[PDB]
Amino acid sequence: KEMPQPKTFGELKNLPLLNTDKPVQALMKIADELGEIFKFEAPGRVTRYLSSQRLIKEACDESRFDKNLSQALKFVRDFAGDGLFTSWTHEKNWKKAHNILLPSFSQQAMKGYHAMMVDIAVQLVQKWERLNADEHIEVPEDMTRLTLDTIGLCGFNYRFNSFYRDQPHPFITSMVRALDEAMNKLNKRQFQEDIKVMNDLVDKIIADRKASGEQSDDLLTHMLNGKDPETGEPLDDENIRYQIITFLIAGHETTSGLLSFALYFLVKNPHVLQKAAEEAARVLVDPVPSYKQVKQLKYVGMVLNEALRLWPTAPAFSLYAKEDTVLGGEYPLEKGDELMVLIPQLHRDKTIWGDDVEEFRPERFENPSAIPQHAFKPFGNGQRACIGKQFALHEATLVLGMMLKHFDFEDHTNYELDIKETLTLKPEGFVVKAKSKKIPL
Ligand code: HEM
Structure with missing residues (x-):
């Protein structure tokens, strides 16, 4: 009932x-040491880091906890606004945009984005086909x-043409x-300029x-045409931006x-790469998928989920208690107290996954309805889960299939x-050589 806490410094x-450069990975070692929940305090602040499915399933109960805007998210808000x-969750524009956009992000909606996805995937494969031997x-x-x-x-029918450049488009x-x-922040002049470069392009x-x-197959058209069923209002131009x-x-x-970690794990486990490559070769029989x-x-789906199990690339999300409540029969919380879900640690909960948690074994996702509720959360939770998941x-x-x-x-x-840490995770400096199978594309 007394909560562990790591070293303090006055x-x-x-x-x-x-x-430190790698805070989530430091936080995982602390979880390894202190267990399924620890307190973590800064001058401003208190949170509790959660690592076990047992506790996280409770944290994911939406009658009891809602999404918190962490410091990171409030800093991002200076340019992401009320997107x-x-x-x-209680901001009017969250519900309006959520109701309007949800069906434009469904699995069914992916049929309409597919051709533009293919357009860029083909540009990627063609770059790699065109590399010389010494590259x-x-x-x-x-x-x-x-x-x-x-x-x-797919979002606004705009081409950054990133494969034509060494220096990215200035928006990027x-x-x-x-x-x-x-x-x-967890400079000021450049931040305002960069904010402006973003709003100006997107406003234009x-x-x-x-x-x-014009009507296109992009999310911008859907938003210009959407009306929130509840209020009957559209999104305004600022929010759409x-x-x-x-x-x-x-x-x-x-x-x-995710695509990086997946290719990493595949080259490190050639038996798994071969099984994925055999599927890709059997399934993708056309020059354009x-x-x-x-x-x-x-x-390939199972490969990606296993990569997401080990290194969920948005590894932590924040919650607050809606009302006073007791977590896991042991930890009294007050209204507004914050929780952090440490997803890499959740995904290594031996009581769910077995002892082999560090091993890359996509077969663990063979039957996705076996996996217990809230054991696997790379896309977050409930109505505040990733609208972009499909x-x-x-x-x-x-793209992995094509590769x-x-x-x-x-x-x-x-x-x-x-693993470099920013808002997200990635295998920094990961490089490979690709030898073409010379199949038409
Ligand atoms: C594998 C790739 C992705 C992962 C692992 C992922 C992960 C997440 C997670 C964990 C959250 C919850 C954040 C929180 O609780 O504070 C989130 C939310 C969200 N994501 Fe993703 N994301 C991915 C790709 C995308 C894509 C491609 C898009 C857009 C096309 C996207 C758009 C969003 C949006 C708009 C939200 C906020 C949803 C809401 O609260 O209404 N994500 N994402």
């Missing part, structure tokens, strides 16, 4: 413990060029710089679209990190995993 409390990711691939870098450009095209530069400044495209009247920024911010690096083919990539999994299944169909991969550096 008035600085535990804060110096995350004054879905940085809004309180290798920078994996998180290329995955991020892919995911940015795909979210740009400002967005990436803005996100890093927001994360480093929205203003251009309303001018022309924030949502577009938000899809880019929330979706670019979580998804590129179809929507239906991507759905038939079951083992878009992310469709994108990654499509595995078109190339053999060599881990030519015997890469050693080094």
Whole structure:
């Protein structure tokens, strides 16, 4: 009933413990040491870090806890606004945008984004087909060029043309710089400029679209046409802008990190790569994959879920208690007390997964309804879960499937995993060589 806590440093409390490049990975070692819940304090603040399915299932009870805006999210809000990711559940625009957008993010909706997803996936595979013998691939870098450009095209029909450039489109530069400044806060002049570069481009495209009247297969058209069933109101132009920024911010690096970790685990486990490659070769019989083919990539799906089990690329989310309540019969909480769910630790809960938790075994997702409620949460929880989940999994299944169909991969550096932490996680410096199977594309 007395909650563990790691080392304090006077008035600085535990804060110096995350004054490090890799705070979630430091927080996992502390979980390893102290167990399923520990208190963590800074000058401003108190949270409790949760690591076990037993406690997290309670934290995921939406009658008892709701999403909290962590410090990270309030810093992101300076450019993400009241878009879905940085809004309180009780803010009017959270519910309006959630109701309007949800069906545009369904699995069914992926049929309409599929062609533009393919457009960028084909650009990626064609870059790699075109590398000379003496060349290798920078994996998180290329995955991020892919995911940015795909979210740009599917979100607002805009081409960042990241595969035509060494220096990204200036929106991307400002967005990436803005996100890093927001994360480093846990400069001011550049932050305002980068905010402006983002709103100006996105405002222009929205203003251009309303001018022309064109209908496209993008999220911007759906938002210009949507009406919230409850209020009957549409989203206004400002909020629509924030949502577009938000899809880019929330979706670019979580998804590129997933594709990166997945390829990492595959090159480190050749038997698994071979099984995935055999599926890809049997399923993707056409030079351009179809929507239906991507759905038939079951083992690729399992690969991605196993990568998400080990390194969920948005590894922590924050909750607050709605009312006074007792967690797990042992830990009294007050209204407003904060919890943090440490997803990498949840995903290593031996009582759910067995003792082999560090092993990469996609067969553990063979039968996805075996997995107990709230044991596997890379996309967060309940109504505040990732609205992008189907878009992310469709994108990654499509792209990994193509990669595995078109190339053999060599881990030519015997890469050693080094996980860089920002808002998200990625295997920094991961590189491979890809030898083409010379299959038509
Ligand atoms: C594998 C890739 C992804 C992962 C692991 C992921 C993870 C998450 C998680 C954990 C949350 C909950 C955040 C919290 O509780 O504070 C979240 C929310 C969200 N994500 Fe994702 N995300 C991914 C891809 C994407 C994509 C591609 C998009 C957009 C196209 C996206 C858009 C959003 C939005 C808008 C929210 C806020 C939803 C709401 O609260 O209404 N995400 N994501």
